[PDB]
Design an enzyme around this catalytic site. Structure first.
Site, PDB file in Angstrom:
ATOM      1  N   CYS A 119      30.057 -54.684-102.727  1.00 28.83           N
ATOM      2  CA  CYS A 119      29.896 -54.881-101.304  1.00 28.83           C
ATOM      3  C   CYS A 119      29.223 -56.230-101.084  1.00 28.83           C
ATOM      4  CB  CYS A 119      28.987 -53.783-100.767  1.00 28.83           C
ATOM      5  SG  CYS A 119      28.782 -53.852 -99.020  1.00 28.83           S
ATOM      6  N   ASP A 166      29.504 -50.486-105.071  1.00 26.89           N
ATOM      7  CA  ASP A 166      29.997 -49.249-104.483  1.00 26.89           C
ATOM      8  C   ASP A 166      30.603 -48.416-105.587  1.00 26.89           C
ATOM      9  OD1 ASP A 166      29.524 -49.745-101.629  1.00 26.89           O
ATOM     10  OD2 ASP A 166      31.002 -51.344-101.873  1.00 26.89           O
TER      11      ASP A 166
HETATM   12  N1  LIG Z   1      31.160 -51.833 -99.212  1.00 25.76           N
HETATM   13  C1  LIG Z   1      30.301 -52.613 -98.440  1.00 25.76           C
HETATM   14  C2  LIG Z   1      30.364 -52.338 -96.991  1.00 25.76           C
HETATM   15  C3  LIG Z   1      29.450 -52.824 -96.082  1.00 25.76           C
HETATM   16  N2  LIG Z   1      29.748 -52.416 -94.860  1.00 25.76           N
HETATM   17  C4  LIG Z   1      30.858 -51.649 -94.906  1.00 25.76           C
HETATM   18  N3  LIG Z   1      31.554 -51.014 -93.921  1.00 25.76           N
HETATM   19  C5  LIG Z   1      32.641 -50.322 -94.220  1.00 25.76           C
HETATM   20  N4  LIG Z   1      33.282 -49.719 -93.220  1.00 25.76           N
HETATM   21  N5  LIG Z   1      33.096 -50.229 -95.481  1.00 25.76           N
HETATM   22  C6  LIG Z   1      32.447 -50.816 -96.495  1.00 25.76           C
HETATM   23  O1  LIG Z   1      32.891 -50.704 -97.730  1.00 25.76           O
HETATM   24  C7  LIG Z   1      31.284 -51.565 -96.213  1.00 25.76           C
END
Ligand SMILES: NCc1c[nH]c2nc(N)[nH]c(=O)c12
Ligand SMILES: NCc1c[nH]c2nc(N)[nH]c(=O)c12
Ligand SMILES: [Mg+2]
Lengths: 259, 259
Positions: free
Chosen positions: B166, B173
Site C-alpha cells: 500500500c 497488505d
Molecule cells: N492498500 C492500501 C490502501 C490504502 N487505501 C486504500 N483504499 C482502498 N479502497 N483500497 C486499498 O487497498 C487501500
C-alpha cells in the site's frame, strides 16, 4: 528492511504504575496475551510463509513492548529467509524476552490450525443493555464510590463498550472487558459509567486494565478479582491484558467478534 | 467530533482500469465486500453502541472508497447520538452510495450475530506447498505465459501467500486468494510464482484482484473465471474484492484465519 531486532521498543511498566500508587509488591498477577495475525517470512528458497503468532508476556516483566515497534519488528521478517519455522519461533522468543526483560512464551501456528475455530464472547452477564443517559465522557474513578453495597456474591460481568484513546497516537482503541469477582455485589450502572468514562482517556491497553483492577480493588474491595480485556488489533497485532488477584492467565486465546 | 460525511474520499476505478487496458464495458462483474469491525456510535441517550458493518460496493460503481477516509468517516460516528440502529444503517447506505456513485448494500450486525461462528478457509486445492525457489520479487505477468496447457477442467485453487504494498501508507497488505475456473488446466507453479510476484508491487486490494483476473483471462483464456481475495484489515476495515465472468456476488462473506 530485513530482520532487525533493534526496532523493538521497551516501555518500563513502572512508569505508569507510579500513578496507580502501587505498594512494594504488585496487588495483581497475570500476563499480556498478544495475537500476531500477520507473521510472514521467506523460507530458505525464498518462498513466502505465513503464520499466526500467540505471545504471552508476564505482567511481572520489567517492560512492555510498544506495539508500533512490535509491528515494525515483525515486518522486518517479511523479506528475510529462514531455514525453518523452528528458527522463527526461537528468534521471537529470544528477541521479545530480551525486550520485555523476562521470558515470554511464543506459539507460531500454521493457518490450518485455525480452521473451524470459533468466534467467542465473554463469560457471565453483559452489562451493556441499560437504560441510562451518559453525556460526560471524561474519566472519573469516583464513579465507583460506594458501588459495592450489595450481598456477598460471586459473579462475572462483561461489557463490549470499552474504548480508550491511544497514548501515543490518539487513535481509538476498542475492547471488551470481563470482570470476575467475589465480594459485595457491584452496582452495574456505576460500573458501566466508570468503564465508559475511559472513552476520551489516554493510556495503553495494559495500563487501562491495571487501572480498572486497582480502582475496583480500592472502591469495591472484593475478596478476589480478575479483570481481563480483549482489544481489537492495531497494525496486525492485538493486546489482551489479564490481571488477577488469584489467577495466572485465561484458559485460551480465542478471538472475539471484533478481533 | 461529530458525524461528517465530507471525510469520505472517492477514488475512480477508471485510473487502474485504464492501466489494464479495459473498456467501459467490463470483462467481469462483482463487488467489493468490506467488513467494518469497529462501527460504534451513541444511542439517543448517549450510551455507546457497537456493531460490525458488512458493506457491498458494486464493481460497476464509478468509485471505490479510500480506506483511511472510510475509517475517519466511521470515527465521526463515535461521539454522535443516533435515534436507532436503523438510522445508522440508513446514513451509511446514503453516504457510501453517494461516494461510490452507485447504491451500496449495508448490514449493521450486533456482535452476538458472530458468537460461535467458525473461521473458514478457502475452497479447493491450496497451491502453496511447492518446493520451488524464488529468485527475485519483481512483478511479472509474463509468468503466466503458457500456464494453461492442460486438459479442459473446472476447478478451484487458492493461496494464502498474496501480499502487495500500500504505497500511500508504506505498509504491506496481506491476502488469501481463491481462483475458480473452467478452461485448460493451469500450471500450479506458474500461478504461484505469478501471485508471489506481487510481493513488492504497489496497488490497492481492489486493483490487484482486477489485475489478477485480467492477467489470467489474457494468458490462460478460461471460458469462465472467478477471483475472490480476502485481505486482512487496516484501520479496522477489511476489503474483499470479488470479480467473476458470470457471478454477481461471492458465495460467502466469512472471515479467514488472519482476518
Ligand atoms: N492498500 C492500501 C490502501 C490504502 N487505501 C486504500 N483504499 C482502498 N479502497 N483500497 C486499498 O487497498 C487501500
Ligand atoms: N494504545 C496505543 C498504543 C500504542 N502503542 C502501544 N503499545 C502497547 N504495548 N500497548 C498499547 O496500548 C499501545
Ligand atoms: Mg452469520
Amino acid at each position: 528492511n530485513q530482520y532487525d531486532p533493534s526496532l523493538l521498543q521497551p516501555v518500563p511498566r513502572s512508569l505508569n504504575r507510579n500513578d496507580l500508587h502501587l505498594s512494594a509488591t504488585l496487588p495483581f498477577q497475570g500476563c499480556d496475551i498478544w495475537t500476531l495475525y500477520e507473521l510472514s517470512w521467506l523460507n530458505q528458497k525464498g518462498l513466502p510463509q505465513v503464520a499466526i503468532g500467540e505471545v504471552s508476556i508476564p505482567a511481572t516483566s520489567a517492560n512492555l513492548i510498544e506495539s508500533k515497534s512490535f509491528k515494525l519488528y515483525l515486518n522486518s521478517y517479511n523479506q528475510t529467509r529462514f531455514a525453518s519455522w523452528d528458527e522463527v519461533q526461537t528468534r521471537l522468543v529470544h528477541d521479545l524476552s530480551a525486550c520485555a526483560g523476562e521470558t515470554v512464551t511464543v506459539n507460531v501456528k500454521s493457518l490450518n490450525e485455525y480452521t473451524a475455530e470459533p468466534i467467542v464472547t465473554m463469560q457471565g452477564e453483559c452489562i451493556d443493555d441499560q437504560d441510562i443517559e451518559i453525556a460526560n465522557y471524561e474519566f472519573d474513578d469516583a464513579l465507583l464510590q460506594g458501588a459495592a453495597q450489595g450481598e456477598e456474591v460471586s459473579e462475572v460481568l462483561h461489557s463490549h463498550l470499552l474504548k480508550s484513546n491511544c497514548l501515543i497516537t490518539n487513535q481509538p482503541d476498542w475492547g471488551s472487558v470481563e470482570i470476575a469477582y467475589h465480594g459485595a455485589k457491584m452496582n452495574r450502572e456505576a460500573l458501566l459509567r466508570y468503564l465508559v468514562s475511559f472513552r476520551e482517556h489516554n493510556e495503553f491497553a495494559e495500563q487501562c486494565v491495571e487501572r480498572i483492577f486497582t480502582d475496583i480493588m480500592r472502591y469495591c474491595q472484593p475478596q478476589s478479582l480478575t479483570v481481563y480485556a480483549r482489544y481489537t488489533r492495531r497494525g496486525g497485532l492485538d493486546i489482551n491484558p489479564f490481571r488477577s488477584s488469584h489467577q495466572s492467565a485465561p484458559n485460551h486465546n480465542q478471538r472475539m467478534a471484533r478481533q
